[PDB]
Ligand binder design. Sequence first.
Ligand SMILES: *[C@@H]1O[C@H](CO)[C@@H](O[C@@H]2O[C@H](CO)[C@@H](O[C@@H]3O[C@H](CO[C@H]4O[C@H](CO)[C@@H](O)[C@H](O)[C@@H]4O)[C@@H](O)[C@H](O[C@H]4O[C@H](CO)[C@@H](O)[C@H](O)[C@@H]4O)[C@@H]3O)[C@H](O)[C@H]2NC(C)=O)[C@H](O)[C@H]1NC(C)=O
Ligand SMILES: *[C@@H]1O[C@H](CO)[C@@H](O[C@@H]2O[C@H](CO)[C@@H](O[C@@H]3O[C@H](CO[C@H]4O[C@H](CO)[C@@H](O)[C@H](O)[C@@H]4O)[C@@H](O)[C@H](O[C@H]4O[C@H](CO)[C@@H](O)[C@H](O)[C@@H]4O)[C@@H]3O)[C@H](O)[C@H]2NC(C)=O)[C@H](O)[C@H]1NC(C)=O
Ligand SMILES: *[C@@H]1O[C@H](CO)[C@@H](O[C@@H]2O[C@H](CO)[C@@H](O)[C@H](O)[C@H]2NC(C)=O)[C@H](O)[C@H]1NC(C)=O
Ligand SMILES: *[C@@H]1O[C@H](CO)[C@@H](O[C@@H]2O[C@H](CO)[C@@H](O)[C@H](O)[C@H]2NC(C)=O)[C@H](O)[C@H]1NC(C)=O
Ligand SMILES: *[C@@H]1O[C@H](CO)[C@@H](O[C@@H]2O[C@H](CO)[C@@H](O)[C@H](O)[C@H]2NC(C)=O)[C@H](O)[C@H]1NC(C)=O
Ligand code: NAG
Ligand code: NAG
Ligand code: NAG
Ligand code: NAG
Ligand code: NAG
Ligand code: NAG
Ligand code: NAG
Ligand code: NAG
Lengths: 125, 125, 125, 448, 448, 448
Amino acid sequence: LGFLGAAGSTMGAASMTLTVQARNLLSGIVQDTHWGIKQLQARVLAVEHYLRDQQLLGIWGCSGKLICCTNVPWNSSWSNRNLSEIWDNMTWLQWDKEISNYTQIIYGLLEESQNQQEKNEQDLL
Amino acid sequence: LGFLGAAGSTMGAASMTLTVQARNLLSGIVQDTHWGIKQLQARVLAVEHYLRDQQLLGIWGCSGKLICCTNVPWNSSWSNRNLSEIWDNMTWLQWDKEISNYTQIIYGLLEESQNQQEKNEQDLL
Amino acid sequence: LGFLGAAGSTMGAASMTLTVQARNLLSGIVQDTHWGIKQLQARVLAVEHYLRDQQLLGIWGCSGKLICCTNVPWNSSWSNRNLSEIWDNMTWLQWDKEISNYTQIIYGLLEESQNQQEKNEQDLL
Amino acid sequence: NLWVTVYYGVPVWKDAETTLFCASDAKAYETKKHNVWATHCCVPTDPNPQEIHLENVTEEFNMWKNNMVEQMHTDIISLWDQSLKPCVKLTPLCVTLQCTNVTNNITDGELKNCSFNMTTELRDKKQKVYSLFYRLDVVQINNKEYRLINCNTSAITQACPKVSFEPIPIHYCAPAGFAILKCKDKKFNGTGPCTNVSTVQCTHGIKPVVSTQLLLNGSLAEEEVIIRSENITNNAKNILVQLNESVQINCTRPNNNTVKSIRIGPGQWFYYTGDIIGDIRQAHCNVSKATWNETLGKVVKQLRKHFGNNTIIRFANSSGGDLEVTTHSFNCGGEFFYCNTSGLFNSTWISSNDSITLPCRIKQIINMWQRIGQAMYAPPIQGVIRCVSNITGLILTRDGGSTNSTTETFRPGGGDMRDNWRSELYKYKVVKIEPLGVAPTRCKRRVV
Amino acid sequence: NLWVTVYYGVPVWKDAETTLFCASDAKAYETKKHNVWATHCCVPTDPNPQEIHLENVTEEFNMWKNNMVEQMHTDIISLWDQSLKPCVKLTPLCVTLQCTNVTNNITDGELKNCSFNMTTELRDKKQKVYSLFYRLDVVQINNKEYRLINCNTSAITQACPKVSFEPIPIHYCAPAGFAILKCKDKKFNGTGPCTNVSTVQCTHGIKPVVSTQLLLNGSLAEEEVIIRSENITNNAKNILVQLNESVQINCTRPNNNTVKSIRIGPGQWFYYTGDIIGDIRQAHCNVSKATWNETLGKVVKQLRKHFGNNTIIRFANSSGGDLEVTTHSFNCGGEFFYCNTSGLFNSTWISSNDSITLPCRIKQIINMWQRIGQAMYAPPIQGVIRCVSNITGLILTRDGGSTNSTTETFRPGGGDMRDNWRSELYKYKVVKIEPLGVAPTRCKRRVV
Amino acid sequence: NLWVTVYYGVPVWKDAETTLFCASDAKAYETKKHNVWATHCCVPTDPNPQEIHLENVTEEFNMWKNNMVEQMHTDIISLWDQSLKPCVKLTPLCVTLQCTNVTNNITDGELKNCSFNMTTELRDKKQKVYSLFYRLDVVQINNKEYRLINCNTSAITQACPKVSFEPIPIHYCAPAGFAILKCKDKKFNGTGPCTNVSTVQCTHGIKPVVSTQLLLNGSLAEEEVIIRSENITNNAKNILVQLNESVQINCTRPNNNTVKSIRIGPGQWFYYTGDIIGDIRQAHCNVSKATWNETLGKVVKQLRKHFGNNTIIRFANSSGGDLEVTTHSFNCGGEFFYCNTSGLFNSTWISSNDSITLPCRIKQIINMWQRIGQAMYAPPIQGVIRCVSNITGLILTRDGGSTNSTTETFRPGGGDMRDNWRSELYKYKVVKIEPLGVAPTRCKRRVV
Ligand SMILES: *[C@@H]1O[C@H](CO)[C@@H](O[C@@H]2O[C@H](CO)[C@@H](O[C@@H]3O[C@H](CO[C@H]4O[C@H](CO)[C@@H](O)[C@H](O)[C@@H]4O)[C@@H](O)[C@H](O[C@H]4O[C@H](CO)[C@@H](O)[C@H](O)[C@@H]4O)[C@@H]3O)[C@H](O)[C@H]2NC(C)=O)[C@H](O)[C@H]1NC(C)=O
Ligand SMILES: *[C@@H]1O[C@H](CO)[C@@H](O[C@@H]2O[C@H](CO)[C@@H](O[C@@H]3O[C@H](CO[C@H]4O[C@H](CO)[C@@H](O)[C@H](O)[C@@H]4O)[C@@H](O)[C@H](O[C@H]4O[C@H](CO)[C@@H](O)[C@H](O)[C@@H]4O)[C@@H]3O)[C@H](O)[C@H]2NC(C)=O)[C@H](O)[C@H]1NC(C)=O
Ligand SMILES: *[C@@H]1O[C@H](CO)[C@@H](O[C@@H]2O[C@H](CO)[C@@H](O)[C@H](O)[C@H]2NC(C)=O)[C@H](O)[C@H]1NC(C)=O
Ligand SMILES: *[C@@H]1O[C@H](CO)[C@@H](O[C@@H]2O[C@H](CO)[C@@H](O)[C@H](O)[C@H]2NC(C)=O)[C@H](O)[C@H]1NC(C)=O
Ligand SMILES: *[C@@H]1O[C@H](CO)[C@@H](O[C@@H]2O[C@H](CO)[C@@H](O)[C@H](O)[C@H]2NC(C)=O)[C@H](O)[C@H]1NC(C)=O
Ligand SMILES: *[C@@H]1O[C@H](CO)[C@@H](O)[C@H](O)[C@H]1NC(C)=O
Ligand SMILES: *[C@@H]1O[C@H](CO)[C@@H](O)[C@H](O)[C@H]1NC(C)=O
Ligand SMILES: *[C@@H]1O[C@H](CO)[C@@H](O)[C@H](O)[C@H]1NC(C)=O
Ligand SMILES: *[C@@H]1O[C@H](CO)[C@@H](O)[C@H](O)[C@H]1NC(C)=O
Ligand SMILES: *[C@@H]1O[C@H](CO)[C@@H](O)[C@H](O)[C@H]1NC(C)=O
Ligand SMILES: *[C@@H]1O[C@H](CO)[C@@H](O)[C@H](O)[C@H]1NC(C)=O
Ligand SMILES: *[C@@H]1O[C@H](CO)[C@@H](O)[C@H](O)[C@H]1NC(C)=O
Ligand SMILES: *[C@@H]1O[C@H](CO)[C@@H](O)[C@H](O)[C@H]1NC(C)=O
């Protein structure tokens, strides 16, 4: 229903449309010396941003998923709201405002829990 | 047996050689101001094409596979040939000619079936 | 403990820190016409190197792993040392010196064993 | 009991600054090889769905912090310089000239008849050249000797006679990962939240119009004249007044000019003013008085909501500065006009056309962008120029120094070209999409 | 009952247009710092497996729609301009010269003795310069005064005497994701399917030879002369005739030239023709008559399969145009020759060398590519030039206007340099590999 | 029984050559718009953790094979040329001048009083210009006529008077995937393994100092003077001597210069030497004798460990060459000095300042980098220059030709600027991280 068409939707409803935004990262497929350099630099920048998202999902064990459950418990200190409000009343943009200061905490924790589990898999094999 | 060495092979036989073509996408690894820009632009373009193929496989749930079965049924309207002809008599280039007008249909359907199944996995967990 | 902080660690201990190096590949995220071109070329080059590592892991069936067991047996001709020395006494840099001439052998074998197994999965389905 | 769940493809974004791609309007008009904008923004548009509404999404906009104005400024200047760059230079014309008055059919002496020995295609020879000049480009050295006014300061380059700078609508498009948010709120004053928001891949087409003290050929406001300022109460800031109705201004260069040329080097051509057929008249622009009067009364009704409806609004002319600062500057028919504006601001409001003619100056050496650097020389245009432009807004400042007498004085503002572009850009914001994020769920990862 | 199965790494492709990378032939010969092609295409080749056969794959080729010709055109011109760009300009030579005839040992006056005051390294001084010129570069102004022929049209730049343009074989290589398909069918006429197809990473090395009305130093056809045209029956098109045998042409510049130089600025050096040791002879080229005759008879046997074997094939000379159009233009020993061709096309076929000598003109100011723009000046060459080139094909057109009399007239065609490059490029096509695709299988995804 | 296990993110690396990014030291000092280095390396530093120790890792270093020196060479030259590029050219000054001796308060005639007609802003007029010049920039043509010494060889461009080249510390940073390994071993002689190794994102800040025959303003050695050479026993190589103590050198340009200017074109400004207030003195530099003596004795103690402690070390002056080769060349206060060094090397060691003053030459046309190409003109500096620099090392060669008499002669070496940069770069190496690798494990892949 358009890129960001789900922006006003609740988080639950919006999670059902995640392929909509994923597919807009590489839209450059469809898309004067000094000028050309700046135009090219823009494409390179878009590529690095794409790759970073993929690397993070990779490290966290969510490389092939749009949605994944993890091995990091939720901290009430990040948010003490219940899931019902978060998924049914609130939208993702609002949610980002609610927890953006913990982005680096959660991400560091995700890296740690996945590293521990990958070691566990190697030891079990 | 060379890049595209399987081009005259049947589709079945050719599927057994898929790593041959996959490995030629990033051959740039082995590989005057105005000229240099054009030379660089070419590398950037190759990268975007590579990434798009990977993203599509990602979205469809085939991110780690050369060959994957999907949750989209085959339409006889795309092709009403039997599998025996398709895999044993016909080559991939011929096949592409047979179904190229449905590329966007199949791809849209693949995105939809995978999105539905990923939701099912999240609800089951 | 820093990039390459594990360089003097044994291979075993160092394997427990692999996320440390993986995360330094895309550090460009944090990071005059003629000059700018050279600066841009450097970013493009870093991207191709990143992608090649990912493609190889992809082909070998280790796309989502930092550590993976494979279907290629170890050749004593590459190294006839026991695992105890390799994992507990020796570091990775030393190990690279011990087996670098077989890099292309092992990689070719990995491509072959994975291609055979992927075919087996498709035939089993 | 809740666990982190990671979601990728999340419909959220952050304020962001990037470079937009420009496109012509699908090359609807080819322009052949004679238009600079069409040449640069060679990229076509596509009449695809233009917008996506974002229901229940409120976004915060600020037209004075909008980096798209900086991009237009940079791109407009850059293109203009690239366009001029390969053209024939006038270094050979920085000579001493002997001048006399032009008296032929003249009632006002605006023109001088000057002559000199100009370089020809061979290095051994010079050609005597005789032509008429406007006083604005000529300075006395001291039948006196004169020089080109800018030959002590910078090189002068002749604009190629084959290249038009006529504005075409240009659309600006987001790079992958970016989106442009558009505010459609008819009451938006340039700052704050907007609920009527939709996103676009590209902005609509905006013409890269340049003007001083009066906004030309822009869009109109709906319902009422809207006055927008970063700081309403600050007399040091320009207030942008967007009209909800256009006013036409009819401008002309009445002198039937005959253009002459000369080869001054190896394929190096120079075009000169030659002489005038018929008599001499001042350049000028006409505005219907009643229309203008109604327009200001509408502006006053709006000024009163900011300053008090018990006030007196007095209008006055430019306070001082050079032509590039105090006059209404615009390009008409390809020529550069510097018109008087004082007759337009001679009234106050206290709580058969009957037009007004504004005299204009014509100048050929242009100190473009008020930048110190190379000057452009505008080659003469054959015949007579007439054009009609749309007044779509005003740029005003207050004098200040008020003692709260309730009478305030408004004068032409101008200066920075960025303020003209803001007139359309206030509607748009650029953001970066940030698809990766997390939220709690009642779901622990299954560990195997 | 069948399901979509997705396959990645599928050996298929689409027609595609990209930029190929150029390489020298592994720098087998260094050329030091004196060769422009070697300098630009600094990238080496590697004698790796050169080709992959595609058994049972038929591909469609069309040499007249082959974008590699456009790339060579663009790259050849671009390099030539970059090469000339940093060299000393001859603007200081656009002066008036006094000329007299050169009569010393002359039986035909091709040369004029001209002189002028040339700029020296100090701005205060000029040097009298005396040198001989070919009439083709000199135009009367009107012991008469003359000027360089192009000083009214464009700047003239001296080619650096240190840089050779001698063609070296250049290989063109595909970017990752691309492949070049090569047709080895000995009967391929430039259009249609080819079954003898293999792929390569790079084309073989093709020399960037430039010539008019005669193809030089290209590859030969096997078995028979092959005549290729986009439109055989259209008299307005050039037919490319590829010989299966070469014919040697021996060209010379017989006048033993003494080169003189002068400093004309701050390290700015100019090289002039000086004078001639010995006597004066016309430049010329020699072709054995019998070989040429056999060559045309072979061409006729092939023309007859297109026009009827009951026909009469008449050959005739160029119909009109400038030297760059009507003569055989080539570079020999570094000098630029414009040779007569009419003696080669003086026969018709009706269903002790005994060579023919073709007189040639020598010209130093070169209107390269028949482009309007800066001219190149070719500095003189010391001594005497002799070279032998290989005639490997002809470029012909028909006059048309036929009444079906069965007699047709063939004349030299030429014009566009792209047609010479097509002579090798007809064998190659560029495609893009498209590894991602689908097919039905009796396999539903297992859903867990 | 073991199987291949693939590990990604492995902490290993290979020797590698890449381009490092440069950064100013967080723009601690702005420099406004007057510093070239600050302008180019606009990128800031960040006082983050600076290093990571690599315990138990031994790395092999070789300062003479270190590609960072090549990068500095390339970047320093490139920036210098970009800086000079947009400045006013002095082509108009390549004229003949009449000169007489300057005799006013002169005891030694270093200066000449020369004059000529210089181009003014109009093409029709010249201005008589009178100014004083150093003999080093003036050559006789033959009250004799003289010219600028380089007007026969290359263009001369005036350095912009607004741009300083004063070295600022510049840090060099690794691209993603690269790391810089730093050796902290106090005894490292430039070649071989180092165990005291840590890695950094960036090198510390190194000033891009240029000098001949003496290293200035670098870091000091700890504990002892360290002599480093690729080939100690080869008399053809430079030995770099790093001091563990600095020696100050006080240099001056004592003549109180009055700077004059002229407009020579359309905003084209030229600055000339004018005249001198007061009397005339030679430029010179002062070094305390005892400090210098101690410094050489320390150098001798170290030379003896390489050549024998039963030796005699004799020092001698430059053997021959131009000023750029034989003198101590440096920039002081913005001026270019070429100082005598012979008084510093007049001693031998056999197993109230009392300073030495070294006379210096001042030259304004600079043959920068000893490259054939455009020359730079250094505009005059108003007033008197005094500066003090730090001698941090010496560059020496041996004469060789030894008969094993045990007496060896050491003379100033110099030449290549790369050797100065090596003085700091010897501590750093660039490597590429190679995260993907394998090892055997007792683990077969589970096959499903
Ligand atoms: C605000 O918007 C108005 C228009 O809405 C702009 O004014 C227009 O400016 C253009 C450009 O100068 C004017 O067009 C000119 O018309 C001349 C002749 O007009 C007749 O012939 C044309 C041919 O198609 C008809 O369309 C037209 O109706 C008339 O029949 C042309 O000769 C001019 O061509 C010039 O450029 C070409 C380029 O190759 C040259 O070859 C020509 O020799 C010549 O130089 C040009 O086409 C248009 O008429 C103006 N409108 C009005 C009402 O006058 C304002 O400029 C704009 N204001 C701002 C600030 O942007
Ligand atoms: C080795 O390192 C030493 C320093 O450790 C370097 O010598 C220094 O060089 C700088 C640059 O020439 C000298 O600084 C100059 O000082 C002049 C006046 O000094 C007084 O005023 C300043 C104002 O802040 C005070 O800091 C200072 O203490 C004094 O009070 C200035 O006039 C000079 O400015 C010049 O550039 C600006 C740029 O816009 C112009 O506007 C000015 O007109 C002028 O051109 C400059 O600041 C410094 O004094 C020197 N030190 C010593 C001890 O003399 C060596 O050069 C360096 N050697 C090498 C090889 O790198
Ligand atoms: C904007 O808010 C309104 C409510 O304020 C949303 O309306 C809901 O629409 C769903 C659709 O099935 C209904 O089931 C709800 O009952 C509606 N809410 C109410 C209060 O009736 C509307 O969908 C929101 N917009 C977006 C984009 O989600
Ligand atoms: C080209 O076509 C021929 C047949 O027309 C293919 O030949 C087949 O080769 C396989 C190899 O084992 C045999 O089993 C088949 O029996 C052969 N076919 C026939 C009809 O005998 C040949 O392989 C094809 N080329 C390619 C590249 O596949
Ligand atoms: C460098 O080598 C020393 C030993 O030579 C390592 O010391 C070991 O540290 C571990 C830490 O728990 C101890 O368990 C070992 O017993 C220590 N070894 C000995 C012999 O006592 C040191 O860790 C090594 N450095 C690195 C980076 O691994
Ligand atoms: C695609 O549509 C065109 C329309 O005429 C048709 O000719 C062509 O065969 C179609 N191709 C496929 C694969 O259906
Ligand atoms: C690689 O081969 C060279 C050949 O001499 C050998 O010296 C080196 O030790 C080999 N390295 C390995 C890892 O076998
Ligand atoms: C034109 O006439 C006015 C009258 O005073 C005079 O001031 C002016 O200088 C004259 N201009 C010329 C060029 O003679
Ligand atoms: C050309 O220069 C001469 C000076 O000798 C001057 O008399 C003449 O008027 C000049 N030509 C023109 C058109 O001014
Ligand atoms: C050379 O002689 C011919 C003879 O008619 C004459 O036409 C030509 O102009 C002469 N050229 C010169 C430079 O005198
Ligand atoms: C230089 O110019 C003078 C004109 O005063 C002319 O007589 C002389 O012939 C010229 N020199 C040459 C070589 O033509
Ligand atoms: C200055 O005087 C010396 C004394 O011999 C003389 O050689 C030199 O040429 C003189 N220089 C000038 C410019 O007169
Ligand atoms: C200018 O040129 C004249 C030559 O006619 C010469 O006498 C005069 O001295 C020159 N001016 C200077 C300052 O040398």
